[PDB]
């Protein structure tokens, strides 16, 4: 059933599972036409498919060519998402395929269920959590690889960098969601926090700066302040 | 005209015959139902005055034999039985008619209701849904589960309706996932019509039989089946025009006949609002939409 606050630690047991977020699959800019009408122009998107225990991000880039000549693109986007997730699972060997796929939006359940009928033993689940994975395109390297793609492409990143060498999955997931919740509430501030100190670099194959443990504690504290603040600045409290 | 005599009426019971019903008191002198129209299936059904639980009854076609009702005090119900001795039967019936101990199937001449509810319903297909091949008539009650319900527990006592499941490999062609799920024409026309039912008459007959079991027995799995078969048509973009026109007539008479006070349990809001207002056929069921809007505007 639905993943929520109560069964949170199931994410970090040894049953392979993936989160799928489709928020950034179909992305548009809205603009005026010469006649003063409005039109959309699609830009590249991505499926965000994440193993929360290991940090594997299977970033399937959705090139704007997949929308050419198609109608009802917001609906197609959910079925395209499901098609690509199903293709991903099929590509994997059996022991490496997930036991559960958790979708972040309920509208992905039926498209993914239908695409996975060949896998009756993979549970497709919703969640009540309001996970901030839409902010994945606020991570500079992810946004960069999506926008530069000239064809469909799958790119692999560890969204935890090397954190698991020192902290547990549970803690790594909590750090990720805090970083993303911050980036989603105030991207400018959030990014300023992460990069304020020039001496702290990001490794070639990483996404985040190489903070020491003590530096992560400071960073994590600053991200909480931001989120609390923007909650005031938004609600006047 | 045919007759279904009763040996006796030892327990107080409401007796139904098709869409009609009458009350019979304990040990009232009642010896059956006469003037039953030939050419249609019929259902004779029962609700005990003491245990309104378990409505039950029997589907039959008087052309297939001489049938009578006799209470069984061991099993506690009115049982349909076949009399093979034709002269014994004629003699019993004539005596009971001469003593005027039978009620008359009370059909108004203008009234095509029963025909319109059973147009495509055949005894031979009923007998494949309700499996009991040593009898020519078929028992149904409120509690019987469907084969599909059993998959989600006694198989001998099941309603073997055709399994319809919109999220099934049978319903969904590999590579047409979105296409087949949003437009079920493949599933209706190729899988179900061409493949399983063979023609739309058999499809409509199972649809009508499922409605009737839902209405007369409050049989939940039958109601599920009726709505699934409606939904499969309404959610198909490509439906033969004659099927749509006939479906509109079928549903019109089902909605017309439904008790005003049972619509809360027998009508699925989601299916009817989807079918009448969002589906591909939202514009194709004019009679059904008008009667639904005038009679159950709350549901919608
Ligand atoms: C096919 N399992 C995935 C592995 C790919 C090669 C390196 C180890 C795993 C890499 N991770 C990073 N994000 C994506 N997966």
Describe the structure.
Chain A: It is found in: Nucleus. Chain A: This is Pre-mRNA-splicing factor 8. Chain A: Residues 7-237 are annotated as: RNase H homology domain. Chain A: It comes from Saccharomyces cerevisiae (strain ATCC 204508 / S288c) (Baker's yeast). The complex is a heterodimer of chains A (237) and B (300). Chain A has 237 residues and is α/β, with parallel strands linked by helices. Chain A has 2 domains: 9-163, Prp8 RNase H domain, palm region (Nucleotidyltransferase, domain 5); 164-237, Acyl-CoA Binding Protein (Up-down Bundle). Helices cover 35% and strands 18% of the residues of chain A. In chain A, the strands form 2 sheets. Chain A has a 6-stranded mixed beta sheet, with helices on both faces. A two-stranded antiparallel sheet of chain A has the order 2-3. Chain A is globular, with a radius of gyration of 19 Å. Helix content of chain B is 41%, strand content 17%. Chain B has helices at 86-98, 113-118, 123-129, 147-151, 177-182, 185-197, 200-217, 220-234, 241-257, 263-266, 269-278, 286-295; strands at 2-5, 13-17, 20-24, 32-36, 42-48, 56-60, 66-72, 77-83, 103-104, 138-141. In chain B, the strands form 3 sheets. In chain B, strands 3-2-5-6-10 form a 5-stranded antiparallel beta sheet, with helices on one face. In chain B, strand 2 (13-17) and strand 3 form a beta hairpin. The A-B interface holds A 76, 79, 82-83, 110-111, 113-115, 117-118 and B 167-169, 172, 177-178, 181. The structure holds the ligand CNC[C@H]1CCCC[C@H]1CN1CNCN1. Ligand W9O binds next to strand 5 and strand 8 of chain A.
Give descriptors for this structure:
heterodimer; A: 237 residues; alpha/beta; Nucleotidyltransferase, domain 5; Acyl-CoA Binding Protein; 6-stranded mixed β-sheet; two-stranded antiparallel sheet; 35% helix; 18% strand; globular; B: 300 residues; alpha+beta; Serine Threonine Protein Phosphatase 5, Tetratricopeptide repeat; 5-stranded antiparallel β-sheet; 3-stranded mixed β-sheet; 12 helices; 10 strands; elongated; binds the ligand CNC[C@H]1CCCC[C@H]1CN1CNCN1; splicing; RNaseH like domain; U5 SNRNP assembly; dimeric; Pre-mRNA-splicing factor 8
